[PDB]
């Protein structure tokens, strides 16, 4: 059996975004991305940008720095309790970013007193817990390292009661992260991409910062440089994964294994993907042209945590 391949129309949203990644929509419908590879004096100076969907014009929302050390923001999720962005930063860890450009560095150390690792991708479950991958070594002012060769990448859970808890470690550059929910809305599986090994790993979610039953969930095709990066679910719990270096987005079924479909990209290096709320439109960031694109998927995306109601009774 061959994996079926579709090639839908990709439309340019914006361009000239150094290391375009972390697409996200806020509670007002505003579109945001990150530009991690922006530099000042040969030093990290990554930016969080807002983009007008009609024109493609860019507004620099936040240029985060802690004690003179610039950030490398990679992955974003919007909160539901307030219109604020949770941003995983490779130099600064987890950040909470306001629309006025002010930001708060969440953790310099974890719950056990260990020094915080630089983060890349984050994902909310419906209970409010933020699951985060950390492929980098220690946060600034430590020297920047990434676990591309040796296994020191970690997984974190920022719980609802504000605890930064390391839930697993010994990953070789952990990348994209997503939560599989059951039909009733209960968090069921935590899917974690491991980039160079071309594998997706899964956990069973038992509760806040509680993961068990670690196993191989899916396989990423290709022997190219790179692998799985940004990823998210559609409404049927199909996982769509940006496969950096393959010119493809992989489509997995709810139970994983081998991809059931491949989406051909007009570029080599998709970095991340995010649905526009209540639509079939996926916004894809990529590193070949350092640009943002959009295409229509077969169905709506999975309801995002920022769309849900904190005081809703259903």
Q: Can you spell out the DSSP letters for 93-159? A: EEEEE-TTS-EEE--SB-TTSPBPBP--EEEE-TTS-EEEEE-B-BPTTSPP-BTTSSS-EEEEEE-
Please, what sign has the CA dihedral across residues 281, 73, 116, 101? negative
Identify the residue whose tokens are 């507004």: 59
Distance between CA atoms of 268 and 277, rounded to whole angstroms? 26
State both tokens at 167.
């839930």
Active site members: 287
User: Is it true that domain 1-314 has CATH number 3.40.50.700?
Assistant: no
Domain boundaries, the chain: 1-314
Residues with Cβ within 8 Å of residue 40, at least 6 apart in sequence = 70
What is the separation of C-alpha 26 from the centre of its chain, rounded to a whole number of angstroms? 15
Looking at residue 299, what DSSP letter applies?
Answer: S
């Amino acid at each position: 059996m061959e994996i079926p391949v579709i090639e839908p129309l990709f439309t340019k949203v914006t361009e000239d975004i150094p290391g375009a990644a972390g697409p996200v929509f806020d509670k007002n419908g505003d579109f945001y991305i990150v530009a991690p590879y922006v530099e000042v004096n040969g030093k990290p100076a990554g930016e969080i940008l807002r983009i007008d969907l009609k024109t493609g014009k860019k507004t620099v929302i936040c240029k985060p720095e802690v004690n003179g050390y610039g950030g490398i923001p990679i992955g974003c999720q919007c909160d539901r309790d307030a219109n604020q962005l949770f941003v995983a930063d490779m130099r600064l860890g987890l950040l909470v970013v306001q629309t006025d450009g002010t930001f708060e560095e969440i953790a310099k150390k974890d719950s056990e007193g260990r020094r915080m690792q630089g983060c890349a991708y984050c994902a909310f479950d419906y209970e409010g817990n933020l699951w985060i991958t950390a492929p980098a070594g220690e946060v600034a002012p430590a020297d920047f390292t990434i676990s591309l060769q040796e296994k020191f990448g970690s997984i974190y859970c920022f719980t609802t009661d504000g605890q930064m808890i390391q839930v697993d470690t010994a990953f070789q550059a952990p990348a994209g992260i997503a939560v599989r929910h059951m039909n009733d809305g209960r968090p069921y599986q935590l899917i974690v991409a491991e980039q160079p090994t071309k594998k997706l790993w899964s956990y069973d979610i038992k509760g806040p910062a509680k993961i068990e039953n670690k196993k191989v969930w899916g396989h990423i095709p290709g022997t190219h440089k790179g692998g799985a990066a940004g990823m998210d679910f559609d409404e049927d719990n199909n996982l769509l994964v940006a496969n950096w270096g393959s010119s493809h987005i992989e489509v997995f079924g709810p139970d994983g294994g081998q991809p059931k479909m491949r989406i051909r990209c007009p570029f080599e290096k998709p970095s991340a993907l995010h649905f526009k709320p209540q639509t079939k439109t996926i916004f894809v960031t990529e590193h070949e042209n350092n640009a943002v694109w959009k295409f229509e998927w077969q169905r709506n995306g999975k309801k995002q945590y920022c769309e849900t109601l904190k005081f809703g009774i259903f």
